[PDB]
Each structure stands twice: as C-alpha cells, then as structure tokens.
Design a protein around this ligand. Structure first.
Ligand SMILES: *[C@@H]1O[C@H](CO[C@@H]2O[C@@H](C)[C@@H](O)[C@@H](O)[C@@H]2O)[C@@H](O[C@H]2O[C@H](CO)[C@@H](O[C@H]3O[C@H](CO)[C@@H](O)[C@H](O)[C@@H]3O)[C@H](O)[C@H]2NC(C)=O)[C@H](O)[C@H]1NC(C)=O
Ligand SMILES: *[C@@H]1O[C@H](CO[C@@H]2O[C@@H](C)[C@@H](O)[C@@H](O)[C@@H]2O)[C@@H](O[C@H]2O[C@H](CO)[C@@H](O)[C@H](O)[C@H]2NC(C)=O)[C@H](O)[C@H]1NC(C)=O
Ligand SMILES: CC(C)CCC[C@@H](C)[C@H]1CC[C@H]2[C@@H]3CC=C4C[C@@H](O)CC[C@]4(C)[C@H]3CC[C@]12C
Ligand SMILES: CC(C)CCC[C@@H](C)[C@H]1CC[C@H]2[C@@H]3CC=C4C[C@@H](O)CC[C@]4(C)[C@H]3CC[C@]12C
Lengths: 439, 439
C-alpha cells in the first residue's frame, strides 16, 4: 500500500497520519523531522589575506648615478634619488659628496601566514537538500536518512521511504558569499584582478599555493631623510585586517527562519521554510485485518479537564466494551485537536485515557478509537503563563474555529435582526399584492 | 579610455569596432572569438555497471534436510530441494534414496570490471562560461583568456579586458545526464535504490569503490533434474549491456546550434547562442593625436569590380594626397559593407586598395580613412557556386529597406499613380468649393 502525505519542515514537531486500507484495521503512523540540511554547491573564486611588504637593503652609489630596472613582481616600484649624503654610526658613508645617489625598491608578496589565516570568496549555485526523519512504524522507532529531492529511495525494515522534492528552494545564502573560519557572510566581494586599496580583496590569489598574485596597495616610494639610509614609503593598510574588525554580524545570527549556519562544509540547518512530501511503501505484512482487530462498542467520552497550554495538557477518558483483548490505533477526526497517543491497548470492559492539545475555546471534536467513533466536548481554560520555551503542538485555528459555544449569542442577535427583515419584507409584499389587485 | 562593444557569440568570425576619442586619430580594433566554453557543474548520483552472479558449490545432505540461513548480500536467495538423487562420473553420489535434500544459494555482486567499464549518472546544476579572445591591439595579435561572467578581468599589454556576462544561459545539457566515455547522453536515469531489472541502473553504487551495492535482477533458483548437480536459475540479463547496444546517437551529434561535446571534464564547446559583451580599457599611450597623424585630402574612390558573395569578393581603390607620411585606421560607415583590412599606410599621392564583403546587389557605402571620408558605389555580380564550406562574412541578408540600383522604375510607377490621385482629389475639391459657394 502506497501512502502519501505532506508535513511542515518545522524541526522537532511530530505529525500523525491515518492510513485507510479497506478490509484492514486503520493504521496510524507518526513522523518527525530531526534535522533538515540545505547544502549549497560552491565554486572558489579567490583567496584573500594579509599582504607582506618586502623592502630589500637600499643600494647606495658613493659617486655616480644608479639606474632602476623593471621587474614582474606583483606591485614592483623603483626610484633613484640624488643629492643624498647618508651617515653611518662611525661617520659619513663615503667621500665624494656631489653625486652620491641612492636606489630604492620595493614589492608586495602574500604573507606566509595566509596558510592558516585567510578568507575565501565563493560563488553559490544550487543546493542539495537532505533530512533525517524518524517514523513510529509498527510500534517501533526507525530512523530514515535520505536526500530530499524525490529521487532517493531508502528501505528500512521493508518499507520504501521517498523524501522530497522540497516545496521551496529558498536559502539563507546569497549567490556570492565569503567564508572565514566558522563565520559565513553574504557580501558582494569585488571581481578578481580588480581590487582596491584598504578594501577587502586588496590582495588576491586563486589558490593558497598559487604563485600568481594580484595586489593593489598603491605603494609609493619616498625620498629618505638627509643623513640616513632608511627607505620611507606610503602604502594602504591591508583591507583584510580592516574587514576582520568590521565584519559585523555573521549569517548564523542574521538569517531568516531561524537557520543555523555551519562551515566545513558550508551548510544551512533546520530552516523553517515550506513543507516536505513523504511517500511510504507499506508491506501487507504490516496490516491487521478487521476480523483480527478488537471491536469496540458502547463507548462514551468524558473530558474532566481542558487547558489550551499547547503542552497536551488536555485530558479525555473514553469508556469502551471490547469484544476481545488486543490493540487499536487512535486518531483525531479534526485538525483542531491533536492526540498525543498513537496506539492504545484495549481489554474487556474498561476505560482509556488520552492527552490532547488544542487552541479551541470549546473542545468539540470526534475521536476514532479503533473502527468506531466517540464524540467529546469540553469548556477549555487559558494558561497562566505568557511565555514558553517550546513551539505549540496545536495547529492554527481560523475565525470560525476559535468560537466558543457561547457564540449562541451571535445566532440569537443575528436571528432577531433577520426576523425583523423577514417580517418587513412580508408586509411590503402583501401591500404590493393588494395594491395591484385594486388598480 | 573605456570602450564597450558587443559581438555575436560565434567562433572563427572577426568583428570590427570603432573607437572614437576626440582629439585623437580614430582607432579600429579587430576582435575574434577562438573558443567559447560552457562548463556545467556536476554532482555524481551513482555508478552503474555489469553485475556478476555467483553460485557456490551446492550442499548435499543424503540422509536429512539441509537448512537455510539468510545473508545481507546485495541480492541473495536460498532454497532447499528434496527428492534429489545426484550422479557423478563413477556412479551415483548419494547412498540414501530417501530424505535426500540439496541446498542451493546464489548472490549478485558488482563485477571487478566495473572499475573500468561503467556509466556515471550525474546531476547538472549551472554552468560557468569562459572564452579565448583574439584582439588586434595596436596592430598586434594578443591572446586574452578570461571567464565570461563579467568577472576575472585580465591585463594584456597594459589593457584590461572584461568579458560577459553572457546574454544567454542556455545549455545543451539537461538536469540529468549520463556519461560513459566521450559520449554524454540526456537520459532520465532512475532514482537511486530503486532500479529495475533488464534496464539501465539495475545495479547501483554511490562510488566505484563502495561496498554498498543495490541490485534488482529477479534472481530465482530452480530445481535440479535428471540426476545432475547443477544449480539452474532464472535471471534478467544486465541492463548495462542492453543500454550500451541501444545507446543511440549521443549529444555530440544531436545537440543544436552546432555545439561540440567533450568529456573529462564535461564541456559544451562553441555553441552559437546569444552574444558576448566586451569591455576594454585602452591606455592613453595607445592613442595618437590628430596633429601627429596624417590627414588626407583630395580623395576619390573607384570600384574595379564587385561580387555580392562571401570571402570579400569585392575590391575598391581609393586615391589620396598623403601629406605627412604615416599610417591610419580604415572603417566602413555602414553595416551593409564590411572592409577586411583594419588599417592602411599612406605615402605620397599613391592609391590604397582594400577588399570588401557585402550582400548588396548594388554597392553603396562610405569609407573613412585617416579621419576623412569618400563615397564608393558599384554594380555587383552574383556568385556561381551555390554552396560553400565557410560562413558568410557579410553582415546580413537583403531586407525590404535595401534594394539594387536602377530602381527608378519603382519611383516612376509610384509617382505616376500618386499624381493621378493628386489630380483627381484637386478636381473634386474645386467642384465642391463651387457647390458650397451657392446660396
Ligand atoms: C521514540 O523515541 C522517543 C524518544 O525521544 C526520541 O528519541 C531519542 C533517543 C532522541 O533521538 C530524541 O531526539 C527523540 O525525540 C519517544 O518519545 C517519548 O518518550 C520519552 C521517554 O523515552 C518521553 O520522555 C518522558 O520522560 C521524561 C523524563 O525522562 C519526561 O520528562 C517526559 O515528560 C516523558 O514522560 C518523551 O517526552 C516522549 N516524546 C514525545 C514527543 O512524546 C517515543 O515514544 C519513542 N517511541 C517508542 C515507542 O519507542
Ligand atoms: C595578426 O592576425 C592575422 C589573422 O590571424 C589569422 O587568423 C587567426 C585566427 C589565427 O589563426 C592566425 O594564426 C592567423 O594567421 C594574421 O594575418 C593573417 O591573416 C590571414 C587570415 O585572415 C592569414 O591567412 C595570413 O597568414 C595572414 N595574413 C597577413 C599576414 O596579412 C597574422 O597573424 C597577424 N597579422 C598582422 C596584422 O600582423
Ligand atoms: C457577542 C459576540 C459579538 C462575540 C463575538 C466574538 C468574535 C467577534 C471574536 C472572538 C474570537 C475571535 C476570532 C479569534 C480567531 C480568529 C483567527 C484569526 O486569524 C482571524 C480572526 C478570528 C476569526 C477572530 C474573529 C473575531 C472573533 C470570532
Ligand atoms: C519591384 C521589385 C524588383 C521589388 C523586389 C523587392 C525585393 C527584390 C527585395 C525588396 C525588399 C527585400 C526584403 C527586405 C527584407 C527582408 C526580410 C528579411 O528577413 C529577409 C530578406 C527580405 C525578405 C528581403 C528580400 C529581398 C527583398 C524582398
């Protein structure tokens, strides 16, 4: 028997479904999502990290003019200065003083620290959904793990579970993300080969091991102080360090729908978005015939207490006469009331107790004990507490559902007004009938 | 100077773009795409290959019943047969002629050959385009390689090149593809864990090295007969072998737009789809001031011959006064006529010769040389060869807004009829004016 249902993607909230296969006793299954993961496919664009400025010892020509040569280093610059007469601790550097000249050069390389401290710029495309499902099958607890794309069949204890496709393709991740350690950010990082000084991605390489490095630090060489050999320069501070200090809140703190974000691999966990279709192939061995099941008659329902605390605080007691000892599945006949118990053992002449959760002001509902149905009713009270640390177990009710039996006031008022109209209409009709009888 | 142009997404076809920077001699750049690659991102779902059936020696219990134990092998069956009386070359094997039973078992496992001969079922998501562009920068041929997603800018000869984004995201690959060798197929392979006998995917594993194997071969053990000891069985033939024989044409031969398909990794190559925006950053050193450039005077154009066919069948000759010796760019002022040469040299009072390609039955175009223009026109002949093995070089085909010479017949007929209407209208107007002058 193939049974198809749809449940909300909310994690930690169980749902029950009734399987109706004529000739067999009704079966009730319970399903709960323990974990839902959306894992994006990423493609690395570049790695950015703190740059290291390299300045070799300056060259001083004691008498004569030095010349610069071009180099292919990422941001190489060279300049020759004249009219320089530097001093050493023991006296003047050299004798000739008229044309003593100096050559200064510098370039930029990625730091050796980039091996452990770096940020990765990724592009995201699509995501593969998967989930860990728990099902109460035949009175046992089975775990089913599958990809939620509708194309993955998993067999547990002779049942074929099909999960997905997902009703929604929404993700907390943007098309362009940056990942640092455990912190994922949705940032529009600059294009490769065209970074800016003082900004994220000022120095870039395609991979950590690459020798091909792009950098834009706007490094400018300056004239040395007279009497000295130091090499002054103007350079933008690393944009990597600024970014680390100004990162702001991470995605795991800002994401919608309570999404949890983790790295290595990058994934979103337990996002409360949309719903998930589930199809179960149930073997005939799992079914009990109606002739095998107990027959329950002479039943009645009492409800000694009801509070809409969303904690299954409602209690109902049903008296029954069983034809024989055995077990029957129990299921609510309304969406307004959820019953915690999936199955109940019945024997002889006795009563069973069940717990339920509802947001109804008046808990008027039908319950199916085995193959027969009882009717329950109660006046429910509000909770004293305002806030709880758990999600409600009951469903959302409409305006027509939340109404109490006290709504009879509405019927009395509406009927009164409707009667006034009906009478006035009759009076006009009678007068018109007479009016056209005499003219 | 920032210059932006757009070219058709074609391969092996040059395009000309005119760069107009006031105060400088006009620059003409020749661009050609040498290769365009669209590379899909794939995620492996499963591997399917040829299954092997293994049948261990049968166990014979001459005086008693053999028992059966189940196994967790990918596809396992076991059965006990009674009333067997097996024979060997030297005579009957079993002494007892009663209570003689035989235990038969068989299982399916992946063949050793699956490490080499297999088909991979992939899920396709998105694709990243890239291209190899030839640019005639400063008259030189330079190679520019970049991604075509409006990113990964590169610098060649101090010029920056940005390619894309592509005008179309169309791909020859469907969401589900199967790869065997150099042949990629758009086949809707069955879901993992639910393959069918006699069909592709009858045996499945997530990876070639995995010990987790799914199989569905409908293997059934049969009873032995005639005193033999063989173990007969019924099993569907591998769906892999059937698929290989019935593969049909691969995507390499069936894909639209002339797309070429390559594998390891999978690529779509040189698809003639949409267009490709190109942005070039041109260094100031690349421009020559109009004061330094040659300026031509007293120019005239003649056209010795014209053929409205491919491969620049037309020829034109332009006379000029060089003034200062030097070189300049040549560009067509119409889209109807394409000039093959990008630039010419000017000296003395010599003429220049260029070739052109047009679909015009009667050529009529202007040519700009060294910032000045001449008017060229000719009657063009048709080609004799109906079919060629190369694409047309001219911009387009004839349209309602373009016609041959000697079309004065159209003007004469139109004018004659229009005159008849104009006269008839005047006659009626004058008569009416008189009629309305009465009373
Ligand atoms: C299937 O298993 C759940 C138990 O919880 C699950 O399994 C565990 C191992 C873990 O994976 C969890 O993430 C799962 O939710 C069971 O659910 C109920 O049984 C609990 C007792 O085993 C019950 O807790 C009770 O005891 C604690 C004190 O220890 C009290 O505070 C509680 O009030 C309660 O009396 C728990 O509350 C139950 N959960 C629900 C949602 O009703 C299922 O019964 C089990 N199925 C079977 C029949 O084995
Ligand atoms: C710059 O490029 C010219 C075109 O290059 C040709 O086509 C390219 C796609 C590539 O295959 C290259 O190897 C080819 O040479 C080229 O000039 C040539 O152009 C024609 C084809 O249009 C070619 O058959 C012929 O050999 C060349 N003709 C010349 C030399 O005028 C050449 O590489 C170079 N020309 C210049 C401007 O220096
Ligand atoms: C004496 C008479 C007028 C009492 C009437 C009480 C009525 C007007 C009140 C009491 C409870 C209220 C409902 C409570 C729940 C909901 C669900 C909400 O999503 C829409 C409004 C709706 C449906 C409310 C409509 C108004 C409501 C029905
Ligand atoms: C008086 C006689 C000679 C008029 C003949 C006009 C013919 C030769 C010319 C005039 C307009 C031309 C058309 C103009 C536009 C188009 C639409 C284009 O998508 C295909 C070519 C086509 C269809 C041209 C074909 C040739 C054409 C039809």
């Amino acid at each position: 028997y193939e049974h198809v249902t749809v449940i909300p993607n909310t994690v930690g909230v169980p749902y029950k479904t009734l399987v109706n296969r004529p000739g067999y006793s009704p079966m009730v299954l319970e399903m709960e999502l323990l974990s839902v993961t959306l894992e994006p496919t990423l493609s690395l664009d570049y790695i950015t990290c703190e740059y290291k400025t390299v300045i070799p010892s300056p060259y001083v020509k004691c008498c004569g003019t030095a010349e610069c040569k071009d180099k292919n280093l990422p941001d190489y610059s060279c300049k020759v200065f004249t009219g320089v007469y530097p001093f050493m601790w023991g006296g003047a550097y050299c004798f000739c003083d008229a044309e003593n000249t100096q050559l200064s050069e510098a370039h930029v390389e990625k730091s050796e620290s980039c091996k452990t401290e770096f940020a990765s710029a990724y592009r995201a495309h699509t995501a593969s959904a998967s989930a860990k499902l728990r099902v109460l099958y035949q009175g046992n607890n089975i775990t089913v793990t599958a990809y939620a794309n509708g194309d993955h069949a998993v067999t547990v204890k002779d049942a074929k579970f099909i999960v997905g496709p997902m009703s929604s393709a929404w993700t907390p991740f943007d098309n362009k993300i940056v990942v640092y350690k455990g912190d994922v950010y949705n940032m529009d990082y600059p294009p490769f080969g065209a970074g800016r000084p003082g900004q994220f991605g000022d120095i870039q390489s395609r991979t950590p091991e690459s020798k091909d490095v792009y950098a834009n630090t706007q490094l400018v060489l300056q004239r040395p102080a007279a009497g000295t050999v130091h090499v002054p320069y103007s350079q933008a501070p690393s944009g990597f360090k600024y970014w680390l200090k100004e990162r702001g809140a991470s995605l795991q703190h800002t994401a919608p729908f309570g999404c949890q974000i983790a790295t290595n691999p990058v994934r979103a966990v337990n996002c409360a978005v949309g719903n998930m279709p589930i199809s179960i192939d149930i073997p005939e061995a799992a079914f009990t015939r109606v002739v095998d099941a107990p027959s329950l008659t002479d039943m009645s329902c009492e409800v000694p207490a009801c509070t809409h605390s969303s904690d299954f605080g409602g209690v109902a007691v049903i008296k029954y006469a069983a034809s024989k000892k055995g077990k029957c599945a129990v299921h609510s006949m309304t969406n307004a009331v959820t019953i915690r118990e999936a199955e109940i053992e019945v024997e002889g002449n006795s009563q069973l107790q069940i717990s339920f959760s509802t947001a109804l002001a008046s808990a008027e509902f039908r319950v199916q004990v085995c193959s027969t149905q009882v009717h329950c009713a109660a006046e429910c009270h509000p909770p004293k507490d305002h806030i709880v640390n758990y999600p409600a177990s009951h469903t959302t009710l409409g305006v027509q559902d939340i109404s109490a039996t006290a709504m009879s006031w509405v019927q009395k008022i509406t009927g009164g007004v409707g009667l006034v109209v009906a009478v006035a209409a009759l009076i006009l009709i009678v007068v018109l009938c007479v009016s056209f009888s005499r003219h």
